[PDB]
Amino acid sequence: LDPGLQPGQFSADEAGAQLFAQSYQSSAEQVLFQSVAASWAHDTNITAENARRQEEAALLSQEFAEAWGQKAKELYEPIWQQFTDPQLRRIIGAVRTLGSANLPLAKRQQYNALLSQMSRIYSTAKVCLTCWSLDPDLTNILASSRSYAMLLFAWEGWHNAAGIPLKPLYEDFTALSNEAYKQDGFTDTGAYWRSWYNSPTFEDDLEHLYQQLEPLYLNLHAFVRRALHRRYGDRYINLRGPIPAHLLGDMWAQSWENIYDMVVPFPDKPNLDVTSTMLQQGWQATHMFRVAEEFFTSLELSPMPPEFWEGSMLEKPADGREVVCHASAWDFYNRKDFRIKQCTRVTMDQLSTVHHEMGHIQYYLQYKDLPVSLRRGANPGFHEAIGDVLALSVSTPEHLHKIGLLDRVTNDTESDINYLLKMALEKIAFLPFGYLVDQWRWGVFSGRTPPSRYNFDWWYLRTKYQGICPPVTRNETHFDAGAKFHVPNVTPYIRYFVSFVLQFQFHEALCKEAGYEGPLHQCDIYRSTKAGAKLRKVLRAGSSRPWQEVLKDMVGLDALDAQPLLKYFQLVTQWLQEQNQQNGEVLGWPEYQWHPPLPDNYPEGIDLVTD
C-alpha cells in the first residue's frame, strides 16, 4: 500500500476517532475511485486484460481495507460503541468490517478471479441457432414472441448456456465468501447481507408482508393462466398447475408487463403500451435519459452533471465488443463522476428502467458530501425504490399524455382496470420472485442447500412462490439460479422485494405532500417542489441515520407496510377476484408436479420459425 494511503497515528479516544475518520475518507476516495474505474473499464469492455486490471485494483482495495480496519480495531475496539456521535459510530463500524480483506492474499486472488470469471460467463453467454445475445435478442424474444417453440428455444438455450458453466465457480465463491465474513463475526454471508437491515425480526417481517400480498399474486396468476390456456391450449397449460416459466414476457418470469397485449381486460380502451409511439416519434436512448432527468429537475432535484453525459454508456456498443449490458448506476466516490451503464432499448419498460437507474444517480448526487462510509441508502431497498417512485408517476395515462406519448385521454372504470392490470403485471408478479431469490441464496450460504441440491431447491422455491415450472426437464447438471444476473454478479436481491413494497409507501407520502387528493394510482408528482423537498430529505441522509427513523420522517411510519400497495391496487384486486370466481378458477397450482410436454418436432424445425 502506498505510504500516502496508510493509516498514521491517532489518539485512542472519540476525538482521535473523528480525526481517524477524516483521514480515512481522504485516502478511501482515491482507493475506491481506482477500483470503480477499473470495474468500469472491465464492464464496458470485457477482456482478460481488463479483468486482470480490475483484480489488481481489488487487491489494492483489500490491502487498504485491512490496514484501516486493523488500525480501527487497534485504537477503538473497546470504545467505539460508546462514542457519543452516532454518525462516527457508523463510520467506525463500517471501517472495522473487512469482508474479503479477511482472506489471506492467495485466497483474495482466488476470490477476485472467481468474481471476474462469473461475470464474464454471464455477460458473454450466447444461444446459437447466427447467435443470440441476452440483450437485445433473447430479451426481445421473451417479451414479444407468441410462438411457444421460439420462446422455449430461447428459455432452454439461455438457461443451459449461462447456468451450467457457472456452477463449479459459484460453489467455490460461496465457500470463500463465507470464510471471509466468518472473520467479521457472521455465521455466513447471508447473515452479513441481512444485517444491513438492522432488524432482529427481518425474516419474520418479510414473511408477514408476503402473506398479505400473496392473495393478489394468486389472483393475478390465475387470470393470466386462463389467458395462456386459451392461447396455447390444454396440452401446454394446466389450469390447476404451474405456468410454464417461458410464457410470461421475461426470461425469469419475474414481471409480466410484456404480455399485457395478450391479457388486456378491455381491448377497446386506449393502448397503454406507448412503445410504438416512442418508436414512431423517433425516441432514442438519450431522449429517454433527458426526459427522466427533467422529471427530477421538475422536483427541484439535481440534473445529471456533464461527467454523467460524457462518461456514461447509454447504448450497447456497436463496435461490437463484449460488455455487461445489465443496467447499473455507478458512484466513483470522487464526488464528480457518476454514470449509468445500460444497453438501452426504445421501449416503455426500458423508460422505467432509465428512471430506476437515474434514481440511483440522484441518491449519489444528494449524499456525495457525506463521509464515504455513509454514501449508501438508508437501507439497500431505499436505493432501489427512488427511481421506481418517479416511474409510477410517469406511467400514469395522465402523465403519458403530458409528455406526448398517449393521445387519447379517458377516466372510466374499464380504463382504470386496464391500467391497474398493466401495473399489477409489472409490480405484483415480481413480488414472489423478489422474495424467493435470496431465500435460495441464504440457504446456499448457510449450507442448507448444498451443491447437490442447487437446482432442486431453486425449482422448489420457484414453484412454491411463483407457481411456475420449467418447460423442459431439469436435473442437477443445470444451475438455473446462475442464469439470473444477480447470482454470478453477487448482488443481493431482497432489496428489490423491500423496494416494491416501500415504493408505494413513498408514492403515497409524496402524493399527499403534493396536495393530491384523488385515487393513489392516478397521482402524478411531476412539478411538485414540496414532494421534491420531502424526497431530497431522504436522499441527503444517506446511511447517516437508522432507516426506520428516516422512513418515519418521510411517511409517518417506522416500518415496511403493505397497505399503501394494497390501496393503490384495490380496484383491480377486487376485479380480478370477481373475474376468477365467475370463471371458476382454482387459486394456486395444487397440481404441483405438472410440467408441459415438448412441442412435436422440437428443436428440429426451429429453423422454420426463425429469421
Ligand X SMILES: *[C@@H]1O[C@H](CO[C@@H]2O[C@@H](C)[C@@H](O)[C@@H](O)[C@@H]2O)[C@@H](O[C@@H]2O[C@H](CO)[C@@H](O[C@@H]3O[C@H](CO)[C@@H](O)[C@H](O)[C@@H]3O)[C@H](O)[C@H]2NC(C)=O)[C@H](O)[C@H]1NC(C)=O
Ligand Y SMILES: *[C@@H]1O[C@H](CO)[C@@H](O[C@@H]2O[C@H](CO)[C@@H](O)[C@H](O)[C@H]2NC(C)=O)[C@H](O)[C@H]1NC(C)=O
Ligand Z SMILES: *[C@@H]1O[C@H](CO[C@@H]2O[C@@H](C)[C@@H](O)[C@@H](O)[C@@H]2O)[C@@H](O)[C@H](O)[C@H]1NC(C)=O
- Positions in the binding site for ligand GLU (CB under 6 A): 326-328, 353, 356
* CA separation for the pair 81, 92 (Å, rounded): 9
Torsion of Cα atoms, 361 then 364 then 81 then 502, to 10°: -40
* CA separation for the pair 512, 258 (Å, rounded): 31
353's contact among ligand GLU, ligand Y, Zn ion, none, with CB below 5 to 8 A by partner kind, is ligand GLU
Count, residues in the chain? 611
Instruction: Sort strands 131-133 and 243-244 into parallel, antiparallel or unpaired.
Output: unpaired
Strand-pair partners of 126: 133
Site size toward Zn ion, by CB under 5 A: 1
* CA separation for the pair 557, 473 (Å, rounded): 46
* CA separation for the pair 399, 381 (Å, rounded): 26
The residue to which cell 438501452 is assigned = 344
Residue nearer to ligand Z on the CB measure, 53 or 595:
595
Is residue 214 part of an annotated ligand binding site? no
398, 464, 566, 592: which one binds ligand X (CB under 6 A): 398
Site size toward ligand Z, by CB under 6 A: 3
* CA separation for the pair 371, 479 (Å, rounded): 40
Query: Smallest gap, in angstroms, from Cβ of residue 553 to ligand Y?
Result: 44
C-alpha cell at 610: 426463425
* CA separation for the pair 156, 484 (Å, rounded): 13
Non-local (6+) Cβ contacts of 265 within 8 A are 414, 417, 418, 421, 575
Active site (catalytic) residues:
357, 486
452 lies in the binding site for ligand Z (CB under 6 A): no
Residue nearer to Cl ion on the CB measure, 351 or 494:
494
Stretch that binds ligand Z, among 146-154, 205-213, 299-307, 473-481 (CB under 6 A): 473-481
Query: Smallest gap, in angstroms, from Cβ of residue 362 to ligand Z?
Result: 46
Write out the binding residues for ligand X, residues 521-560 only, by CB under 6 A: 522
Q: Compute and round to an integer the Cα radius of gyration of the chain.
A: 24
384's contact among ligand Z, Ca ion, Zn ion, none, with CB below 5 to 8 A by partner kind, is Zn ion
* CA separation for the pair 211, 122 (Å, rounded): 33
349 lies in the binding site for Ca ion (CB under 5 A): yes
Residue nearer to ligand Y on the CB measure, 49 or 607:
49
258 lies in the binding site for ligand Y (CB under 6 A): no
CA angle, 568 then 570 then 574, to 5°: 155
SS3 490: coil
276, 411, 413, 477: which one binds ligand Z (CB under 6 A): 477
Is residue 360 part of an annotated ligand binding site? yes
Distances (CA, A) of 87 to 8, 132, 365: 22, 49, 19
518 lies in the binding site for ligand X (CB under 6 A): yes
349's contact among Ca ion, Cl ion, ligand Z, none, with CB below 5 to 8 A by partner kind, is Ca ion
Residue nearer to ligand GLU on the CB measure, 220 or 354:
354
Is residue 384 part of an annotated ligand binding site? yes
SS3 339: strand
Nearest residue to the partner ligand X, using Cβ = 518
The residue to which cell 439461455 is assigned = 158
99, 311, 380, 387: which one binds Cl ion (CB under 5 A): 380
518's contact among ligand X, Ca ion, ligand Y, none, with CB below 5 to 8 A by partner kind, is ligand X
376 lies in the binding site for Cl ion (CB under 5 A): no
Residue nearer to ligand GLU on the CB measure, 503 or 544:
503
Write out the binding residues for Ca ion, residues 251-270 only, by CB under 5 A: 258
384, 426, 561, 585: which one binds Zn ion (CB under 5 A): 384
Select from 149, 264, 217 the least CA-distant residue to 589.
217
Q: What is the 3-state secondary structure (H, E, C) of 221-283?
A: HHHHHHHHHHHHCCCCCCCCCCEECCCCCCCCCCCCHHHHHHHCCCCCCCCCCCHHHHHHCCC
601 lies in the binding site for ligand Z (CB under 6 A): no
Query: Smallest gap, in angstroms, from Cβ of residue 45 to ligand Y?
Result: 4
C-alpha cell at 186: 457472521
Is residue 197 part of an annotated ligand binding site? yes
C-beta neighbour count of 500 within 10 angstroms: 25
82, 452, 475, 582: which one binds ligand Z (CB under 6 A): 475
Residue nearer to Ca ion on the CB measure, 138 or 560:
138
Which residues are annotated as part of the binding site for chloride? Answer: 197, 495
Which residue ranges are tagged as binding site? 197, 356, 360, 384, 495
Residues at the site binding Cl ion, with contacts judged by CB under 5 A = 380, 492, 494-495
Instruction: Report the interface residues with ligand Y, using CB under 6 A.
Output: 45, 47, 49-50
Binding site for ligand Z (CB under 6 A): 473, 475, 477
- Judged by the rule CB under 5 A, the positions of this chain that interact with Ca ion are 258, 349
Which chain residues interact with Zn ion by CB under 5 A?
A: 384
